[PDB]
Amino acid sequence: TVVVTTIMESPYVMYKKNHEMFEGNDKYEGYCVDLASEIAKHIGIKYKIAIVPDGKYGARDADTKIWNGMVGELVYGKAEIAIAPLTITLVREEVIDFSKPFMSLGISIMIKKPQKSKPGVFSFLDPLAYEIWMCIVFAYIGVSVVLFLVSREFGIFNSLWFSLGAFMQQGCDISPRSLSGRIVGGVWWFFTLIIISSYTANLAAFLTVERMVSPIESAEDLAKQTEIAYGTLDSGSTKEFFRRSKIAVYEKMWTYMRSAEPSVFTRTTAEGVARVRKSKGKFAFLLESTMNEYIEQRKPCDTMKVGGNLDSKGYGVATPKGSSLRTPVNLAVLKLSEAGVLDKLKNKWWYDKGECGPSALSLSNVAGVFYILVGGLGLAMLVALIEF
Template identity: 50%
Template sequence: WLENRLPAPATRADTRGTQTRKKEFHHSSRQPLVGDWTPTDNVVFMTNYTKAMTEGYRENLKNKTLTVVTIGGNPYCMEKEEKERTDENSDVQYKGYVVDLIHEIAEVLGFKYTIKLVEDGSYGRKNERGEWNGMIKELIEGKADIACADLTITYEREAAVDFTMPFMSLGIGILYKKHKKEPPRLFSFMSPLAMDVWVYLITSFLGVTLFLFFVARFSPYEWVNPHPCVKEPEELKNNFSMKNTLWFTIGCLMQQGCDIMPRSLSTRVLAASWWFFILILVSSYTANLAAFLTVERMVNPIESAEDLSKQTKIPYGCVKSGSTEAFFRNSNFSTYARMWSFMESYRPSVFVESNTKGVDRVKKGDYAYLMESTSIDYIVQRECELYQVGALLDSKGYGIATPPDSPYRSIISDAILKLQEDGKLHMLKERWWSGKGKCESGKDTQKVQGSASELGLANVGGVFVVLAAGSCIAIFICIGEFIWKMKNIPRNERDHICVELLREIKYVICCYGNTRPIRKVSDVDGVIQPGNGLPFMPLTGYQDMNKDEEKERDLVRYDVDRDDTPQKFTYSNDSKTNIYEADYYSNYKASDV
């Protein structure tokens, strides 16, 4: 190579004064001096040899026509429509990111180019015999000068051809179809709470109702005089019948209240526990119901590559003879190795000929496609029913491939670096990725993570503990009230406390009714006390009226005339006289006279 390019020899004197023939060799007559050759010292290159050679190659590249091989695919290289085509030259028959990138590089370096599609439609893969296919094969065989496409830089390809610096960074992602939004259910109001919470709530409601019923019947302070005006009643009444108790608990549950309220300390403790239980549960239900009504819920069967590898219901694959296939085939990571074993053994085959066919298969449903994240970003901007699952599986880049030891690699890398510094690479990506997108968001993973979730038993289990603790405390207080009641009865008028306790439990369990005969209790002075026998807890509504101070009331009735004149009643006392007029239907009207 040097002998064919050596110019005429030149004679120079060395430092020792002897004449030695030296040859100054150039790459061409237009290129600068790169070194000297002598028979004794052989080749002596100049210190700026690399820079000089690069400048020489750059000058040689100007006005030269390069053959660019690429592969079809959105948005990198697409055929123009009929109305967009021209007959000037072949390169204008295509459009896309790669076409614009080659055009920008050609503007910087000043060369011409022609674009052709790869013959076998493959990126490049080495088979068992060490033979390459696709664009890598055409570069090795000299059918193309450069290969510009969404061609991933890999170790295996780098050993066969040369790559420029990456013009785009990316990683492997998972493309999947969104699940359709579920229509509202008839009982969607039950969604804020899990099913087990609803079961426990109904059980607690019935349990508290029965518990309050028995505690109220067992407590002596819930048996009151049904007629407060009667000083010595014959029987006492308990307002907490089964129907009233059920109405009380359901009124509290619906936060509507009830006209029956507990009187004794034990029933009040139990009621307070039930109220606290309802307060927390209803507040949690209301807050979570608002989230369910405002947040769109999306159910996704897979959230990451780990989820994808642990199931076999949804098949997944990638493009055939691509870098993604090589990544899984050569990976030693357990998850990716398991995924490759599944893809290789699954039938029918999960591998596709191109990204377009892979996307079409994803649209049909029940298929996940593994592809570069840049292509996924482009697709999800235009196909709103698709989205990217999880994070990227790796990190790599796209580069322009050249034949081995090509002098144009460093020159094209410098041009790519200049385009990156000028912001043109970013402008090209925005033009072809986001410029014509119709979807609002390319990724819905954040929406899935931010959706509302039902409250399980672990979230609201504490209120059940509070309710159970309040019920237990109410039992002990109720027993204490009964013992206190028995202590106030003389020993000769009652049995042993345990016997009385068992008798009372039997009376409560057998449900003999809401009334019971009053028990006459003698105090220490032998005076019979009416009611419940507690001087410090008088009967509700009872007033000891002094008959000497009571005013006499007269009621005078006049007969009704035949012409239906109103009846007249006269009520007299010391201060005034009221005349009540009543019509035929006894609707009274009072006036002071």
């Protein structure tokens, strides 16, 4: 029975919910658990699923050169095949034989979802700072009274009506027919015109800039701006990609990361994911494309994928140099890719089994006006009854 060496990394492999009830190769489920099954079916090789005792993908001990993880299991002749998300890299392929890629991974940017749906009820006041709304109400009462004094028709219940009507630019009523009174109206009209023009102009400024801001969609975008903090992992090739790169865009990124504080290199991948979710659109974690898609397709469904692939990588099946099954596996992997079976399994374990299946002004943006209108009309009805 061929000994398989796979790694416990969702969704590729993950123990079943009620796994204690099961035994053997049936206790495990995951993308890899279907890939190995399908490959066996074609070739015809009994496969006993075994788990990497340690939990490392593979990296020769810097001190003793000893191979670790499943890469070590293969070379040391303890596992005849390796079905896992094992990247095709020199060091690895220098000791083992890799199958043609089954999933072209790459680098991708993770950010939080827009979630920009909190238009406060009183959002029609943002252009003009409340301190001016406190200075208008006073000025209005301050102006209305002066129009009464200098005119003693223009009583104290009609002056408030003229001043209020003049400010809203829909007022005719009765015009001041005294030179002294007309002075008050003229300055109030000039005061009215500036405020209305200022409010209209400033409001357009708020909307256009919010319409011009765009989310990051490329590597240049993430680097040209330093507002969002973009970090990777301390270990792994997620950062090495830049420690020996040559493209200007990448070179700049490395500089920012190695300088910005605190440590952008999160201790673990799980930390980076949480950081983005708990930063309100201020941290952009960098992780492999495959795992990036998985995270976005699970609850709380707040992360997202932007752009494409900065680099080009690929996974594959692994076998020791000189295995009796180097051609059969390679042909079977190609046969699955042509038949679309890899896309079927990818869809199943990423979307089908994903808990989450899939410019204009809204009423909320102007909710404050519609509320002070229903309440205002409600105040009137009371008055009409109280006077009655």
